[PDB]
Nucleic acid binder design. Structure first.
Lengths: 81, 110, 98, 98, 98, 110, 81, 98
DNA sequence: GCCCTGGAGAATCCCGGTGCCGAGGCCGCTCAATTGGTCGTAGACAGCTCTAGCACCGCTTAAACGCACGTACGCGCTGTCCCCCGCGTTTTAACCGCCAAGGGGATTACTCCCTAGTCTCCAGGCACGTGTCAGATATATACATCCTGTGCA
DNA sequence: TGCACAGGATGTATATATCTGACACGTGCCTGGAGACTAGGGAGTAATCCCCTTGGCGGTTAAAACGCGGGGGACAGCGCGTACGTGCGTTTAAGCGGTGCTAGAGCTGTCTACGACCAATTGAGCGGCCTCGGCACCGGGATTCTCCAGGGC
C-alpha cells in the first residue's frame, strides 16, 4: 500500500513546470494548490483508464487505455499509439 | 489472363494507401456502403495534411542543424502554423515541449 | 521463435511523403509514431463527420461528397481549400484512369 | 563580495532553459508511485505498462504547463508578476473545470 | 388532405415517466422538445462510447457490458452507479421473463 | 396459433421502448451486431436519467406554483443538481435563462 | 444586399445581456468588443450551418442545420429538434 | 428634489430582473438582418427557417451571457467592478478562442 | 460634526377576474415490433508461450532540502478626475396583424448504375536482420550578459 | 550627484573529437488488395403539391437615442513590510545497471449459443381533431426597499 506520494511532486518540480509555463515568480501557496490540481487531473484520467482496463478484463493498465481515457476527456495525446 | 495488378493509389497518383483506407472505411462502421471515390478523396486529404506537417517540420529540423525530424520539430511546426495549430488545438505532442514565449511585462527594464 | 502478429501503420507512406517534401531529411521513431497517430486521428475525425453527414441526410453511402463536406467542416480555411483541391484532383485522376 | 544575480535574472534564465528543452520535469519514480497510489482506489493489484506511466506523465505535465500559462495571464491581468492560488482558481474556473 | 409524415419521438415515454414521478404535473411542448433532444443526446453519447469500446476490444457486438462500461465512462459518479443499478436490474428482469 | 405479443419493455419492466432502442442501435452504424440485453440496458438508463431530470424539474415547477414543466424549470433542475449539471455542462437549454447569481462584491456595502 | 447590421445589436441590448451575465458596471468600450465577438461567433456557426445546407442541396437554412453546426462546435442546443 | 437612486441600485435591480427572466434580449428583426448579412458572404439567395433564426439567436445570447459571466470574474479578479475589453479578451484567451 | 431613525417615493409583490390557446385525451390506422424458426459465426473458454512487469540491490551523484539574507514586490491608503449611471425627453423602428405570391422542401415513382459479395491470385507491406552515421556527450573556448563600482558632466 | 561605461564573474553558444545505437535499407513471405464478374437496391431524376418564406403595408408603442448632472470607481502614486529569489552546504533518494521470477498478455483451436434474417401478424404509436383549464394578462392595493434630511449622541 502506497501513502503520501503526492509530496513526491516536489516544490522544485512544480517550479520547473511553472518556468516552462513562463512564470517568473511563484507564491509559496502555489505548491499545495498545484498538488491538488494534479491529483484531481490524475484521478479523472486514471479512473477512465482503469474503466477501459476492466472492460477488457485485463489486470494491466496499458498505454492504449491511458490514450483512450485522455481522448475521452478531450485531451488527445500523440506519441503512444 | 487477368490484367497485371495496379494499386488504386497509383491510379489516383497518391502515396497513401487507397485500398487500405477503403478497407478501414468499410470496417469502421461509418455507413452501410462506401463509394469508390470516398477512399481516394480521403487518402488525398490525409496525404496533403501529412505533407504540410512534414514540410514545416523539416524546415524546423533544418533550423536546428538536425537532419532527422523529432517530436520537438513537429511541435514547433504545428504551434507556429496558425491553421495546423487550430486543427491540433487540443492535441498534446509527446516530448514536444512548448514555444519560447515570455510575457513582455516580465522582462527586465532595459 | 514466432514472429509478432503484424501491426499495420502509416509509417512507410509518411516516409514516402517525407522523401517527397524533404529528400534528405529523416525521421525518428517517436516522430513517426506521432505522425501515425496524427493520420489516424484525422482519419477518424473526417470519417466520423462524413458518417454523421450521411445520417443527417438519410443516406446509406459515404461518398466523395460526404468526404469533401467533412473536410470543409473540419479544416480551417486555407487548409480546407487546399485539401479540397487535392481531393478533387485525385478523384478526377482516379476516374479518368479507371 | 560574492556574486549574486538579482531576483528575477535566474528566473528568466530558467524560463528560457525549460521552454527550450522537452524532457519531463517531474521525477519519474515519485510520479509512478503517485499514479499507482491513485489507481489503488479504483482497483486492487493493478499492473502498469511503463509506457502507460510515461503517457500519464506526458499528459499530466502538458496539462500543468498549460494551466501555468493561463495562470500567468490571470496574474498579469491583476497587475502582478507573482502567480497565486486565486490565479490558478480563476484560470480553472474560466476553463470550465471548477 | 396530405397527411404529414410520421415523426418518431420519445414524447409519450417521457410523459409516462413524468406521470410516474409527478402524477399531477404536465409539460409544455417546448419542455418536451428539450426532453426529447436530451434523450437523443444521451442515447448518442452512450451508443457512440459503446461503439468505440467494441472497436477498441476488436469485438463485433455491442452487449450489455459495453453499455455498462459506456455508462460508467460518461456519467458523473452517483448518476453512473444508480444508472448501472437500474440497467442491470432491468436486464436481469428481462432475462428472467424471457 | 401464435402466443400473445408482449413488448420487450413490458418484460424488462421499462417505460422506454426497448424495441425502438434496439432498432435505433441496429440502424445507427454502431456495431455489426447488437446483443439482446444492450437495448434493455440502454432503455433502462435513459428512463432513469429522464426520471431524474423530470423529478427535479417537477420540484422546480412546484416551487414556482406552476403545474406544468417549462424550459425554465428544466434549466433550474439541471444547473442546480451537481451531477446533472456536469452531464449537461456543454448544453444550452432554449428559453432556460440562467441561475440567479450576483457576485458578493457587487452587493451594496450594508 | 444588407450592410451595417451589427449596429442593430444596440448598446441597451448588450447591457441587458451583461445584466443577465451578472455584470454591474460596463465600460463604454465594451460594446464594440462585444459586437466583434458576436460577429465572430455567428460567422463560425453560420459557415457550418450553410455548409450543411449546401451538402443537403437545399437553399433554406434549417433549424437542424443550425443545431448540427452548434453541436459540431461543442455548443449543443436543446429545444429545436 | 427629484428622486434619484444611487449609481448601482438600478443596475442590481436589472441584474435580478434579467436573471429571473428567460426571454431573448436582442431585438429579433435586427438580429435576423445581421444573420442574413453574415450569410450573404457564404452563399447568395439563402433562405432561413424562422426556427433556424431563433436557434441562432438562442445560441448567440447564451454564448454572450456566459462570456459576460467569465468577463465579470476577470474584472473582479483585477479588483474592479467594471468589465473592460481586456477582461473580455482575457476570458476568451483562457477559454481557448483567441 | 457625524451618525441613526423616519418618512416619502418608487418598485416589487400579492390577489382576483378574464379569456384564450395549447396541453391532454381520444380515434383510425398503418407500419414497425413481436413470434417463431433457421443458421452460421462471434465469442467464450481452455491451454500454452513467453513478454514484460515487479522486486531487489548496490552505487553514484544529481537533485532536494533547509537556511540565511535582502530586496522588490504585493498591498493598503490617498487623492483626483473622468466616465459611467440614472433619468427625463424625443425619435425611431420593432412589433403585430393581415394579405398575397411563389420558391422550394417534401413526396412519389421508376429505373439504372454503383456497390457489396465472391473467388482467385500475387505483390505490397510487415517482421526481422544488420551496419553505419547522426546525434549525444564531453571539452575546451569564445564570446554575450549581468551587475556593481567608479569616474565624471 | 545621479548617470554610462570597465571590467570581472558567470553563463551559454560553439567548434572538435568519440562512440554508439537507432535509423534506414535489404530479404523473405503471406495476407490482403486487385481483377473479374454478378445481383439488387440506393439514389438520381422528373413531376407534383402545398407550405412556409418573403415581401409589403399600416398603426401603435416600446424601446432606443440623446443629453445632462454628479458620484464613485479607475488609476496613479507612495510607503512599508514580508515573502520570495538566490546561493550555499548537507542529505537523500532517483537513476541506472544488473539479476531473477512469474503474472498475465496474447495467441490458437473448439464448439456452441446467440444474433441476423425472414415471413406472418397485429397493436403501439402517430397524426389529426377537439376542448377546457392553466397560465398570461391586467389592474389594483399591500409591502418592502432605498435614500436623504434632520434629530440626537
Amino acid at each position: 500500500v502506497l501513502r503520501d506520494n503526492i509530496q513526491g511532486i516536489t516544490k522544485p518540480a512544480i517550479r520547473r513546470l511553472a518556468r516552462r509555463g513562463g512564470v517568473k515568480r511563484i507564491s509559496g501557496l502555489i505548491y499545495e494548490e498545484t498538488r491538488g490540481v494534479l491529483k484531481v487531473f490524475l484521478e479523472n484520467v486514471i479512473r477512465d483508464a482503469v474503466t477501459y482496463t476492466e472492460h477488457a478484463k485485463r489486470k494491466t493498465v496499458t498505454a492504449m487505455d491511458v490514450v483512450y481515457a485522455l481522448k475521452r476527456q478531450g485531451r488527445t495525446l500523440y506519441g503512444f499509439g | 489472363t487477368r490484367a497485371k495488378a495496379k494499386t488504386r493509389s497509383s491510379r489516383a497518383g497518391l502515396q497513401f494507401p487507397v485500398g487500405r483506407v477503403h478497407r478501414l472505411l468499410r470496417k469502421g462502421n461509418y455507413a452501410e456502403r462506401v463509394g469508390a471515390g470516398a477512399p481516394v478523396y480521403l487518402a488525398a486529404v490525409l496525404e496533403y495534411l501529412t505533407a504540410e506537417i512534414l514540410e514545416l517540420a523539416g524546415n524546423a529540423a533544418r533550423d536546428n542543424k538536425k537532419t532527422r525530424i523529432i517530436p520537438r520539430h513537429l511541435q514547433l511546426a504545428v504551434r507556429n502554423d496558425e491553421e495546423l495549430n487550430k486543427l491540433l488545438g487540443r492535441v498534446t505532442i509527446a516530448q514536444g515541449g512548448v514555444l519560447p514565449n515570455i510575457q513582455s511585462v516580465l522582462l527586465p527594464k532595459k | 521463435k514466432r514472429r509478432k502478429t503484424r501491426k499495420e501503420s502509416y509509417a512507410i507512406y509518411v516516409y514516402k511523403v517525407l522523401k517527397q517534401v524533404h529528400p534528405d531529411t529523416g525521421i525518428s521513431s517517436k516522430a513517426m509514431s506521432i505522425m501515425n497517430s496524427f493520420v489516424n486521428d484525422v482519419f477518424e475525425r473526417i470519417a466520423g463527420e462524413a458518417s454523421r453527414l450521411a445520417h443527417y441526410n438519410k443516406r446509406s453511402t459515404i461518398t466523395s461528397r460526404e468526404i469533401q463536406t467533412a473536410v470543409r467542416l473540419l479544416l480551417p480555411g486555407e487548409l480546407a481549400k487546399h485539401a479540397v483541391s487535392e481531393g478533387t484532383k485525385a478523384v478526377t485522376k482516379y476516374t479518368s484512369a479507371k | 563580495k560574492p556574486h549574486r544575480y538579482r531576483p528575477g535574472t535566474v528566473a528568466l534564465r530558467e524560463i528560457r532553459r525549460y521552454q527550450k528543452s522537452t524532457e519531463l520535469l517531474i521525477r519519474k519514480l515519485p510520479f509512478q508511485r503517485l499514479v499507482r497510489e491513485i489507481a489503488q482506489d479504483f482497483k486492487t493489484d493493478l499492473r502498469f505498462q511503463s509506457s502507460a506511466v510515461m503517457a500519464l506523465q506526458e499528459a499530466s505535465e502538458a496539462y500543468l504547463v498549460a494551466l501555468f500559462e493561463d495562470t500567468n495571464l490571470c496574474a498579469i491581468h491583476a497587475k502582478r508578476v507573482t502567480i497565486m492560488p486565486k490565479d490558478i482558481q480563476l484560470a480553472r474556473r474560466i476553463r470550465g473545470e471548477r
